[PDB]
């Protein structure tokens, strides 16, 4: 879909890059970024917060003639260790798979917000970029990024410049 | 020639994660769920100091082995600490009956 990320974009996880007659640069899409952050932050906290250990004491002492019990205690510790290790490894891998897909989904949704908003006033070129058929100055770029773009306003210029 | 591009943040992070399908995936941000640090000290549990018997074991301390006389007495203990080198108790050879049960009862 998109080849890689941007390093000049340092104000959030998701965003826009623009170039127009008056300037160029990067800016975060704050609503998208903050929602992704809150979702993920809560996810991480849930993984941690849900475990609630009781005050305990793990070690036990057995004597010369209590080997069967000592071995029972070992059996218990080993069983719990395998369960926790196995579940912990899988939980992390599963959550990581989803976190990364989650982020990819949000990028696509950001793209669609713009594609739907611009319609025929911009050429869709690829790799996350659009080109306006009509002149689109800083005021225009902000209205597209903000979801407030007026399609009809520029439709005459855009179709004239299409052919 | 006015244009607009949609994308995402990149960073200089070298932190990698594994996923179910992939290994060694670099991510911009990550959190560690596994604690691998300790402070190298024996601390108070819930505000109460351990009983440190040093070179004596519990039987030495309870019976009053002549070499455990120098140990101080705390009115409360959170846990008991013995060194691996501890070897003072039952100086007159013999069995200490239900020693493990006594040790368990005195732990706190």
């Amino acid at each position: 879909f998109i080849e890689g990320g941007w390093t000049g974009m340092v104000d959030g996880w998701y965003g826009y890059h623009h170039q127009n007659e008056q300037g160029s640069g990067y800016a975060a899409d704050l609503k998208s970024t903050q929602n992704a952050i809150d979702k993920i932050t809560n996810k991480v906290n849930s993984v941690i917060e849900k475990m609630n250990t009781q005050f305990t004491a793990v070690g036990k002492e057995f004597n010369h003639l209590e080997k069967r019990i000592e071995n029972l205690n070992k059996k218990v510790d080993d069983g719990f260790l395998d369960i926790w290790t196995y579940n912990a490894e899988l939980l992390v891998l599963l959550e990581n798979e989803r976190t990364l897909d989650y982020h990819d989904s949000n990028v696509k949704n950001l793209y669609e917000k713009v594609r739907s908003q611009l319609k025929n006033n911009a050429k869709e070129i690829g790799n996350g970029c659009f080109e306006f058929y009509h002149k689109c100055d800083n005021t225009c770029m902000e209205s597209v990024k903000n979801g407030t773009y007026d399609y009809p306003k520029y439709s005459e210029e855009a179709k004239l410049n299409r052919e | 020639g006015d244009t607009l591009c949609i994308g995402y943040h990149a960073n200089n992070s070298t932190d990698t994660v594994d996923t179910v399908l992939e290994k060694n995936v670099t991510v911009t941000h990550s959190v560690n769920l596994l604690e691998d640090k300790h402070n190298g000290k024996l601390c108070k549990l819930r505000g109460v100091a351990p009983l440190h018997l040093g070179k004596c074991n519990i039987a030495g301390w309870i019976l009053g082995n002549p070499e455990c006389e120098s140990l101080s007495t705390a009115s409360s203990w959170s846990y008991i600490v013995e060194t691996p080198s501890s070897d003072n108790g039952t100086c007159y050879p013999g069995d200490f009956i239900d020693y493990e049960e006594l040790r368990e009862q005195l732990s706190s």
Partner: antibody
Amino acid sequence: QLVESGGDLVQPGGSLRLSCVVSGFTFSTYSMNWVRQAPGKGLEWVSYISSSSLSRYYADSVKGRFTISRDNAKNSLSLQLNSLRAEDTAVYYCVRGSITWPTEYYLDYW
Amino acid sequence: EIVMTQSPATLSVSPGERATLSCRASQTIRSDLAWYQQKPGQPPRLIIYGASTRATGIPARFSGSGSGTEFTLTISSLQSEDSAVYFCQQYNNWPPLTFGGGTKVEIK
């Protein structure tokens, strides 16, 4: 890989057609620009066109006077210089831009 | 836009001597910078395409470095082949692309 024609010189108030043809590049996947080197001066960027032809930029110093068009089927880039001034006498170069347009644009082929 | 200047208008060292050039921006570039070496009568050649990352076909003699506004070109050993005019461009902010005036490197 790229042949350039500077259009020769005319007196101020006149006009010139400049043209470049490229054979070592697709000229459909790459943007192009013009850079002007006046004798005794530094290197000045003058103008830019994307391969879609929908995107063009000019230096303020040439706005309203210079214009760019291209024809991808001919591998050619055209620049029309109108209302020429003495200050416009310079060596003009055609430069093939980087492929990675939205980020790193460093003019790798002259 | 971003104004680029180059202070060391003349850099003149003996053959084989290490030498450097500086570039300064009025605004933060964040390594979105490129360096050129121009032989008389020729279009300039790209030597470093990033502020520091070397262009294809360029020898180890050249490398760069830099930060937000200050950038450097290092010539590890100036060769008889290297007298040239050097330039910095920027591409961090570019309706137009901009360049600094450029400086000359000469051999004693």
